[model samples]
Target chain A: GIVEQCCTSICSLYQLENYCN
Target chain B: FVNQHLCGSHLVEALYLVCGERGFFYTPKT
Candidate 1:
């Protein structure tokens, strides 16, 4: 999932694990 | 081409609006 990579990158980059899920 | 990526821009833009920029594109294949 290329999109998954992007989403995970962003969430990890900004510590958005709690929100970007 | 673009369809092969299956609407990646949709998700990309959504995150862009939220997290600034990913600067990536699901461009067409050669």
Candidate 2:
């Protein structure tokens, strides 16, 4: 999903694990 | 941190838009 891509890429880049999933 | 990563602004902004709409907590900065 598009949302998941954003969540994974952006959140992961910031190391915001909680937001990644 | 934000300035250095500004190139990713649109990308993260989209994240905010999506997450915000989905009621997810959007963290700021690095």
Candidate 3:
């Protein structure tokens, strides 16, 4: 497959937040 | 976009949604 998923990694979402501020 | 690609909001593509994994997600795309 092209995409490989392993973890929920919700913190990744916050990555965007870090930059927003 | 994240800090590396900051300055403006672009797009985010989660692995789960992109992979159709139907389960846990990894490597959040942006």
Candidate 4:
């Protein structure tokens, strides 16, 4: 449960962009 | 097999996060 939520939140944050082109 | 798949999925997710944090672009070149 925690890993799932953690990965989900990390993915959401990753979509923020700027770090990758 | 199912358990292994899930473990692989998590591994991939972790790798993606690490690469993303480092700004490493991963492109599948065949």
| Clashing residue pairs, backbone N/CA/C < 3 A, model 1 | none
Lowest-sum lDDT 10-residue window in model 4 chain B: B1-10
Q: For each candidate, what is the lDDT?
A: 0.37, 0.41, 0.29, 0.38
Off by over 4 Å in 1: A1-21, B1-7, B21-30
Model 2 Cα displacement at B16 (Å)? 0.3
DockQ of each: 0.06, 0.12, 0.06, 0.07
Candidate maximizing DockQ: 2
For residues B1-30, could you state the per-residue lDDT of candidate 3 as single tens digits?
222221111223443332333443232452
What is model 2's DockQ versus the real complex? Answer: 0.12
- Between candidates 2 and 3, the one scoring higher on lDDT is 2
Model 1: per-residue lDDT, tens digit, A1-21?
A: 444444333333332212232
**Considering summed lDDT, which 10 consecutive residues are worst modelled in model 3 chain B?**
B2-11
Better of 3 and 4 by DockQ: 4
Q: Largest lDDT belongs to which candidate?
A: 2
**Clash totals in order:** 0, 0, 0, 0
Which residue pairs collide in model 4, if any? none
Q: Higher lDDT: candidate 1 or 2?
A: 2
Candidate 3: which stretches are off by over 4 Å?
A1-11, B1-30
* Candidate 4, TM-score of its B chain: 0.41
Could you tell me the TM-score of chain B in model 3?
A: 0.24
- On TM-score, the leading prediction is 2
Residues A1-21 of candidate 4 have per-residue lDDT tens digits of 323433333334333232244
